[PDB]
Amino acid sequence: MVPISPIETVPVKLKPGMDGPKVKQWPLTEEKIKALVEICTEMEKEGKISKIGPENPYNTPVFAIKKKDSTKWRKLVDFRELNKRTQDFWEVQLGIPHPAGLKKKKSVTVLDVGDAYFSVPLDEDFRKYTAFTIPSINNETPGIRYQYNVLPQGWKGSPAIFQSSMTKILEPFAAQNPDIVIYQYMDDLYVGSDLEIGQHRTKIEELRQHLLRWGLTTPDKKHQKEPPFLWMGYELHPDKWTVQPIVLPEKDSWTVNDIQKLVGKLNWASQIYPGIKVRQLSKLLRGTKALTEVIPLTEEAELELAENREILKEPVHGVYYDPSKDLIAEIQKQGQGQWTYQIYQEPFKNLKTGKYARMRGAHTNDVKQLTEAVQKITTESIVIWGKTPKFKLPIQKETWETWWTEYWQATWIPEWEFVNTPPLVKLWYQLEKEPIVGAETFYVDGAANRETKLGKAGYVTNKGRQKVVPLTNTTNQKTELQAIYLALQDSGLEVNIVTDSQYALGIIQAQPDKSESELVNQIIEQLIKKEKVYLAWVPAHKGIGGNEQVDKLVSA
Amino acid sequence: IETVPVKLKPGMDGPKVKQWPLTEEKIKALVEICTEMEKEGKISKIGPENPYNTPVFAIKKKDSTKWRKLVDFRELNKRTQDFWEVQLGIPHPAGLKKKKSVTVLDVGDAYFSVPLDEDFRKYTAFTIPSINNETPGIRYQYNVLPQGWKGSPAIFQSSMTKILEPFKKQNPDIVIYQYMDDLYVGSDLEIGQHRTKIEELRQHLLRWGLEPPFLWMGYELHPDKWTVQPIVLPEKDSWTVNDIQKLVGKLNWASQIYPGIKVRQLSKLLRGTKALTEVIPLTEEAELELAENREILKEPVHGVYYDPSKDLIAEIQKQGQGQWTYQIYQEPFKNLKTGKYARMRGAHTNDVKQLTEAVQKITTESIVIWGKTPKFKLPIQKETWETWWTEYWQATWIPEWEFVNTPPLVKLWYQ
Ligand SMILES: Cc1cc(/C=C/C#N)cc(C)c1Nc1ccnc(Nc2ccc(C#N)cc2)n1
Ligand SMILES: OC1NC=Nc2cccc(F)c21
Ligand SMILES: [Mg+2]
């Protein structure tokens, strides 16, 4: 025989203070017991389990399940209880590669490593916790007791320890063969290269020979799986990728559940189909989670769906990444807080696409949303490609400069250029830095009675213009905004406005262009029509002329 | 050479912090650094039975081209037992902030000479990610005191005091304070003298070492010249209604800090409903009230004391044109330090880089004055900061921060 290197065991512990499982074995039919005994005799012959004496106090239940449409039974050891008591492990598969970050490959071969799995020994000191019992025929002898010597299927640590054991075996091969890539998924190794097929097949044989150093055999009759690969919802081909087919159902009426499934499909599709939208369809899911409830589709939701069906009418593919080329990201505004983007290197050949939706919030504006979208694409790009794309944005350079130099927060967008494709992001209003000479001055105020919710809003001006409006079902905050609105309504194109409302100033200084408050929206529409507006704040109740008078008129 | 036993705080597991996305250049740098650290025995590969993690990235220190590994041990530092066994603490030197020059040395390479307690090492686990997660992240843990962990200066302290005895005895007027991986060395000598004493100091550590990659550097400060921002009111010959309104607003705000501030007589100038740009003559009663307020504002704030048991809070405002104001306090309206920057280096078209530099300068001031870092209230959206701050960071510590989403009215008063 040829010596083989052992696979180093991973030391394993139970969580602190916990003991192993002691779970009752269910009674089984005479038929199932005979099947399990034969199954375990074979597993024992292969070294996977060993019989144990009666001292071991642990137990996990075992079942026999009929493999459908076959007379062959299959064994199932139910490790749910041991798994609760087993330590946590490092899970390497948490982040999965995105196809758009892969590199084109001339050949990709698959190798079955299912047999290696059972060359992976279980830590000797943990094996006792894996004990199980085949019940005896008629319960007239002790059940046969076994424990595992290898990683059990269904045990919490088996995926992480198998992957870490295979990676350690593979590392020297990969390091010394930088002209291939190797990826492990389930019981398969995928090996890709750009070598001419003869050299590529040579590397495969060399890999098989490396694996034999650990006694790991791979099937000669080469794998049936060949490009294209169905993997994690994608189709991988040698020189392009896409999502597996996206089929939106026809339906006469839609359930909560149906709409959740539809939105999930659209979201999946949006990584390569440009322009997908889900706002109106997601609006239908607001608040409710009665999975069987039917929701009428708004007209707006029907148009969104129809637009999506059209996008999905024929296949679209992405290209893979060429590290020798820059990455470009282009963004478009779609409306209703929705943004879409494409990432490419050569014109018209996207690596991937995607979308971004406005964050929930009271007030917002397009520049902030565009900035957030940029920040999201940047981070996604670092994950996939390790670098920030150059951005093509629908905002003039002068608009951005005006925005960031005057905005109260620090803000930044990385290297970008203007793309003149409507709709353009613009600043809808900008407040003055100084009081306006020659513009009338409006001193505004409002107040409300907390119990009756009656209030007043109004203004007085240096020209003697005055207004007070009685309001019902209102609050101090609302009346303070109503007063500013009235001043904007009744003033000329240039106006100075004096308020004592810290609330209103906080809103306006955030520079919204759209709000959940219809009063804020009305204020914004008035601001857009002005040529100049200066908003001045003063402290309340301090004897400030103008302010004192209007406060008196509105608190009456 | 023998390990100090280290524990986490009671009822407290190890850190499990996600690794954030790294650029290709930072990954390649970390792979090269960690391959060498591993050869030198400072770190070792770990297996999947270690589920812990602390983020890592890489920086370039001020004025260098070589990458430095920076581990973000903020979570591990919170979870690590406090170190009072030999000393309740190193009473912070109040004289350090009084020296004419303070030079900051990166001495963290010395920590690598002390082994870390074998039972604690698992908690220092970190991962070098791969682009697109195409290969398994490279997993390591420390075998020696790590840079950036709060235990390292504590455990090394005995060794450091002994290394420095000859220099201290020979130069008794020098203040030497250690904070995490930094050594702060303050003198009142002429800078050419000063630089030479600093180099004298390096040699003691080069000597003891027998090479440290950033020990040769020196960050030069001058705290005796550090400026503050008292409250000042305008001096004008022509006051508009708007000017007086802004003055009354500022004085109202100041009256929360200073008791005896009055605005009655100033408010009285505005009687009526006047145009904002109209000029108003000050009455005598108003000029007197204003003068009295000016005099109040020349005095210190009452009842301001530092409590070492409370967090320091730092607030920053963007003022425009590269200017930034800030306040450090523990209780509202009781500022311990205020200040203002403008010299924002190589960042004229980048707000975030400027803010990141301000955060580092304020932290440095905080370390020098109180020996700990403040919690920042940053005027930036979380997602913007988190995407970019690591690109501009040059310090070997990292403070805590939160985000300000509503514009503060008080920015106006610090202008
Ligand atoms: C992540 C991954 C999944 C699969 C396979 C998963 C499964 N099933 C196969 C491989 C080889 C990889 N690894 C890498 C790494 C770098 N570039 C590539 N490019 C690449 C991969 C497959 C095809 C094809 N056809 C084309 C290019 N793959
Ligand atoms: O999440 C997914 N993963 C893979 N394929 C999909 C297909 C349709 C919807 C969907 F959510 C997914
Ligand atoms: Mg009022």
DSSP assignments along B17-36, one per residue: PPPPP--HHHHHHHHHHHHH
Determine, for residues A506 and B407 on separate chains, whether the beta-carbon distance falls below 8 Å: yes
Q: How far is A197 from chain B (nearest CA, A)?
A: 23
Whether residues B185 and B105 share a domain: the answer is yes
Angle among Cα A486, A488, A489 to the nearest 5 degrees reads: 65
Determine, for residues B273 and A460 on separate chains, whether the beta-carbon distance falls below 8 Å: yes
C-alpha B278/C-alpha B83 separation (Å) is 64
- CB-CB neighbours of A350 under 10 Å: 23
DSSP letter for each residue of A472-499: SS--HHHHHHHHHHHHHHHS-SEEEEEE
Instruction: Give the residue numbers spanning the domain of B84.
Output: 5-94+120-160
- The residues pairing with B245 across neighbouring beta strands, listed in sequence order, are none
Handedness of CA B258, B264, B268, B272 (dihedral sign): positive
Buried-exposed string B143-174: b where 16+ CB fall within 10 A, e elsewhere: bbbbbbbbbbbbbbeebbeebbeebeeeeeeb
Task: Return the structure tokens found at A16.
Answer: 């602190």
Structurally, chain B folds into a number of domains equal to 4
Residue A554 — left, alpha, or beta (φ > 0 → left; ψ -120 to 50 → alpha)?
alpha
Task: Return the structure tokens found at A433.
Answer: 């830095």
Whether residues B57 and B83 share a domain: the answer is yes
Placement of tokens 């050869």 in the chain:
B39
Determine, for residues A164 and B320 on separate chains, whether the beta-carbon distance falls below 8 Å: no
Beta-strand ranges (E) seen in A245-319 are 254-255, 294-295
Q: At what angle do helices A518-529 and A476-490 cross, to 10 degrees?
A: 20
Shortest CA distance from A174: residue in chain B:
B135
Q: Cβ neighbours of residue A296 under 8 Å, at least 6 residues apart?
A: none
In this complex, which of A96, A97, A409 lies closest to B381 when CB atoms are compared?
Answer: A409
Q: Collect contacts of A215-219 with beta carbons under 8 A, ≥24 apart.
A: A215/A4, A215/A119, A216/A113, A216/A115, A216/A116, A216/A119, A216/A169, A217/A115, A217/A116, A218/A111, A218/A112, A218/A113, A218/A115, A219/A112
Task: Return the structure tokens found at B253.
Answer: 């705000």
- CB-CB neighbours of A365 under 10 Å: 19
Residue A369 CA, distance from chain mean position: 18
- CB-CB neighbours of A71 under 10 Å: 7
Determine, for residues B271 and A545 on separate chains, whether the beta-carbon distance falls below 8 Å: yes
Alpha helices in B40-96 (DSSP H): 74-79
Q: Cβ neighbours of residue B252 under 8 Å, at least 6 residues apart?
A: A539, A542, B261, B263
- Report the candidate in A317, A342, A339 with the shortest Cα–Cα distance to residue A328: A342
A73 DSSP 8-state letter? E
Placement of tokens 């994950």 in the chain:
A383
Domain boundary among B187, B220, B253: B220
C-alpha A196/C-alpha A179 separation (Å) is 12
Strands B375-378 and B400-403: parallel
DSSP letter for each residue of A342-393: EEEEETTEEEEEEEEE----SEE-HHHHHHHHHHHHHHHHHHHHSSPPEEEE
Distances (CA, A) of B99 to A70, B4, B175, B222: 87, 35, 8, 7
3-state helix, strand, coil in chain B (%, to 5): 35, 20, 45
C-alpha A504/C-alpha B145 separation (Å) is 53
3-class secondary-structure state, position B246: helix
> In B, which residues are within 8 Å of A161 by CB distance?
48
Which secondary structure element, helix H or strand E, spans residue B385, and what is its range? helix B382-392
Handedness of CA A255, A257, A263, A269 (dihedral sign): negative
Whether residues B251 and B336 share a domain: the answer is no
C-alpha A192/C-alpha A201 separation (Å) is 10
Task: Return the structure tokens found at B245.
Answer: 């309104």
Whether residues B153 and B12 share a domain: the answer is yes
- Report the candidate in B110, B69, B98 with the shortest Cα–Cα distance to residue B201: B110
Strands B375-378 and B313-320: parallel
Whether residues B231 and B358 share a domain: the answer is no
Beta-strand ranges (E) seen in B86-179 are 101-106, 126-128, 138-142, 175-179
C-alpha A488/C-alpha A481 separation (Å) is 11
3-class secondary-structure state, position B261: coil
Structure determination technique employed: X-ray
Domain boundary among B270, B289, B306: B306
Handedness of CA B197, B199, B200, B204 (dihedral sign): positive
Placement of tokens 């917002």 in the chain:
A364
Whether residues B195 and B334 share a domain: the answer is no
Task: Return the structure tokens found at B286.
Answer: 């108003």
C-alpha B84/C-alpha A20 separation (Å) is 38
Domain boundary among B220, B235, B250: B220
B406 DSSP 8-state letter? S
C-alpha A339/C-alpha B407 separation (Å) is 26
Distances (CA, A) of A142 to A133, A137, A146, A478, B302: 9, 10, 12, 80, 84
Q: How many residues does chain A have?
A: 556
**Is the bond leading into A228 cis (omega within 30 degrees of zero)?**
yes
- The residues pairing with A190 across neighbouring beta strands, listed in sequence order, are A110, A183
- Report the candidate in A347, A529, A156 with the shortest Cα–Cα distance to residue B48: A156
- CB-CB neighbours of B256 under 10 Å: 10
C-alpha B181/C-alpha B59 separation (Å) is 15
C-alpha A196/C-alpha A106 separation (Å) is 8
Strands A363-364 and A390-393: unpaired
**Is the bond leading into B15 cis (omega within 30 degrees of zero)?**
no
Q: What's the burial of A31, exposed, middle or buried (CB within 10 Å: 0-12/13-18/19+)?
A: exposed
Instruction: Answer whether A241 contacts ligand 1 (Cβ < 6 A).
Output: no
In this complex, which of B132, B352, B406 lies closest to A410 when CB atoms are compared?
Answer: B352
3-class secondary-structure state, position B238: coil
Distances (CA, A) of A115 to A46, A67, A221, B44, B319: 11, 21, 15, 30, 67
Q: How many residues does chain B have?
A: 415
Contact A547, A498 (CB under 8 A): yes
Best probe of the B interface among A86, A408, A444, A491, by most B CBs < 10 A, is A408
Whether residues B247 and B354 share a domain: the answer is no
C-alpha B146/C-alpha B396 separation (Å) is 12
C-alpha B100/C-alpha B129 separation (Å) is 44
Placement of tokens 């304070």 in the chain:
B177
Ligand 2 atom nearest to CA at A267: 11
Whether residues B289 and B148 share a domain: the answer is no
Placement of tokens 């927060």 in the chain:
A409
- Report the candidate in A538, A493, A432, A488 with the shortest Cα–Cα distance to residue B242: A538
Q: Collect contacts of A499-502 with beta carbons under 8 A, ≥24 apart.
A: A499/A444, A499/A445, A499/A535, A499/A536, A499/A537, A499/A538, A500/A445, A500/A537, A500/A538, A500/A539, A500/A540, A500/A547, A500/A551, A501/A446, A501/A477, A501/A537, A502/A537, A502/B409
3-class secondary-structure state, position B291: helix
C-alpha A198/C-alpha A195 separation (Å) is 8
Interface check A537 vs B, CB under 8 A: yes
C-alpha A179/C-alpha A176 separation (Å) is 9
Whether residues B28 and B143 share a domain: the answer is yes
C-alpha A421/C-alpha A395 separation (Å) is 9
Whether residues B214 and B226 share a domain: the answer is no
Whether residues B282 and B231 share a domain: the answer is yes
Contact B130, B122 (CB under 8 A): no
Contact A458, A467 (CB under 8 A): yes
Distances (CA, A) of B138 to A161, B159, B336: 15, 32, 45
In this complex, which of B21, B48, B352 lies closest to A164 when CB atoms are compared?
Answer: B48
Whether residues B11 and B153 share a domain: the answer is yes
C-alpha A353/C-alpha A274 separation (Å) is 6
